Design a protein around this ligand. Structure first.
Ligand code: HEM
Ligand code: HEM
Lengths: 362, 362
């Protein structure tokens, strides 16, 4: 029911994937480094309470009548619901507070990729908070109260709600399906694979940026799906796009979802074949994304897709080579990348006296 | 994760326990062929039987001819029914078509202008609606998406609204949920067990003057934006004064327990509960069944937040209209704005496997 907040690493990366997401990018409006550090400390105090299912500050009620309550109250009576709060720092943060020479080289700007149609207003950001929980109101409450605590020092640049599986009704070892109807997550780095996490996800001291040791790098892409076009494709076209069948999710020519793929049996521009580590010099990613459905656009089409999140030890050797290799992906006909951001996710909060960003700000 | 029975004298999704998630879609009709529209209603009813039982529509999501699109888009495969209910309604504009003019119920009244309205016409109205409620958002989206696909060329989605969490209750024996202002919302509603009150206030009766509507209800939908910046800087006393209940327990002012009966004379004259209470409106009583929403940011550095208000009633003229008229002096008006609106006639239930949505009208 709760996930420990403290550790060598931030929670919400290798910890079990929760049913819901509220992801928010913030822009910083203060130039005062001391005021920003103060905020990080207050945010960390609030996060400790939130992830344990307690209200922030003095609480949501019972205080002075003439004062606004410290907590806005909409999570009263709810459980912690495995809430994790994961903070990250965008490249643009390092132009402030004299941090320019502390930007990690692994926090690389992404190139323009073919077919990008990025909405500037739903891209970038000085920092992010990823709120994952099994109850979406727990996640929203966390973001709403962090933004309220930060008011005057940060503003919300963009936000995205997402959903995965509903654990109360769906088994844990069942692979969830994305909104194209295919199982999504079969060949991924699991949180149990400590060695693969050290190799592919966690920043190491020898990587060149000491304050990031134990952190990770996050790529976020809001990927719209062209639902109505996809739904008019034949079953064979859909399966040819991925290289797996739709019902079982087995690789072509195999029987079971978890059978290892035979890449030469897939079409040359099939998604799995292009994204597989063997096709990318061994590049391997921790995918931790969520489906979204925001409504319908002005043409009646479903505004839906995948809020893709990938964690890696170095953006240059993780997301960039794989996404570059998708230049000819058969899936490109049915998707469009419309938002993007990258973040350096710092190491964990070690104990009750530590605070978000302490290794960077000291 | 269980199924809610689809057949009955009334449609499910009204008196039914309120499910965690909402996907509401309003459709406009694009065909002038009454026969083709009746055929759609029958095909939609057949799909709804499958969907509410947790089965795929038509011949299924895979295993068909490779060269044909699958009958079901597949993203709900392996999921439980999740208490999915599908509730159809007919908007007043529908009755300008198919020779239905003289069948428009008088109880399906157009709403007057209310002070403070700022209604977006694009996200208002609609020839018909489908309310999809379920505990699993993927199940709800799947249902809307597949109904829309089946209806291609005969209906188009006009607007849609997702609700990430309920703000209503038809089960007073379960915990009352909170809206994004942090107050319990749903304490004094109509419970699904209160058969006499549902007959008096919710279900249309033959004697009311429209026989085809016997057993149905009337639905008002209002999209309400919340000014959370303004609210969140108000004092606790101000917030509690606005409603007439305390924030922590949700008891009427002066009393100890949520479900103690309000003593209205102890509330401020402009308190929401005092103004909305049946005793202040000649006995007018509503079944409220709304959900919270957030659609990103407002572009001004803040989270967007609202309440998608849904009310069912026996006659719009004796339910929503008098109550909302009495809210002209509501203290809550300082913190909300109605920005979308629609009314629908919700026909009687689908009696058995031979029946179909709208059969008593057509
Ligand atoms: C809407 C967009 C996308 C959809 C629907 C999608 C869907 C899928 C599916 C169905 C699979 C096979 C099952 C699995 O192993 O998870 C898969 C695998 C994979 N995808 Fe995607 N994907 C999308 C975007 C991306 C992007 C943007 C990247 C990276 C830049 C990516 C990288 C991968 C990787 C690495 C695998 C595993 C390949 C393997 O090792 O077998 N995907 N994806
Ligand atoms: C964002 C908008 C609104 C919010 C935050 C809100 C909030 C509340 C709250 C906190 C209660 C007290 C607990 C309860 O009995 O449910 C309440 C009661 C009630 N509300 Fe609202 N409400 C809103 C809009 C409306 C509207 C538009 C109507 C009808 C036109 C309405 C009608 C009622 C009724 C009939 C009651 C029960 C009064 C009683 O019999 O005691 N509300 N509302």
């Amino acid at each position: 029911s709760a996930v420990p907040f403290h550790g060598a690493h931030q929670a919400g990366i290798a910890t079990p994937v929760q049913d819901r997401l509220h992801f928010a990018a913030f822009d910083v409006t203060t130039e005062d480094r001391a005021a920003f550090v103060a905020l990080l400390k207050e945010w960390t105090a609030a996060a400790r309470r939130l992830t344990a299912g307690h209200a922030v500050g003095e609480g949501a009620y019972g205080g002075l009548p003439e004062a606004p309550p410290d907590d806005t109250g909409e999570a009263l009576g709810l459980k912690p619901s495995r809430l994790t709060l994961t903070i990250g720092f965008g490249p643009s943060l390092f132009t402030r507070f004299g941090l320019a020479d502390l930007r990690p080289e692994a926090l690389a700007d992404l190139p323009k990729f073919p077919g990008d149609n990025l909405d500037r207003a739903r891209s970038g950001g000085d920092l992010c908070v990823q709120a994952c929980a099994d109850d979406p109101q727990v996640a929203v409450h966390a973001i709403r109260n962090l933004a309220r605590i930060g008011f005057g020092k940060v503003v919300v640049r963009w936000s995205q709600l997402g959903f995965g599986k509903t654990s109360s009704t769906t088994p844990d070892k069942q692979t969830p399906r994305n909104l194209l109807g295919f199982k999504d997550g079969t060949r991924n780095i699991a949180g149990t694979e400590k060695d693969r996490l050290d190799r592919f996800v966690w920043a190491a001291e020898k990587d060149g940026t000491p304050w990031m040791t134990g952190g990770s790098y996050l790529v976020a892409r809001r990927i719209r799906m062209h639902i109505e076009t996809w739904d008019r494709a034949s079953l064979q076209e859909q399966e040819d796009v991925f290289g797996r069948d739709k019902g079982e999710g087995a690789p072509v020519g195999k029987a079971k979802e978890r059978d290892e793929p035979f890449l030469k049996a897939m079409k040359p521009d099939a998604h799995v074949r292009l994204a597989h580590p063997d096709s990318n010099g061994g590049a391997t990613l921790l995918r931790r994304g969520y489906s979204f459905t925001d409504g319908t656009d002005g043409l009646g089409r479903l505004d839906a897709g995948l809020f893709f999140l990938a964690y890696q030890r170095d953006i240059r050797t993780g997301f960039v080579p794989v996404q570059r290799n998708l230049a000819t992906d058969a899936l490109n006909e049915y998707i469009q990348h419309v938002g993007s951001a990258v973040f350096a996710v710092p190491p964990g909060v070690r104990d009750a006296d530590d605070w978000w960003g302490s290794t960077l700000f000291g």
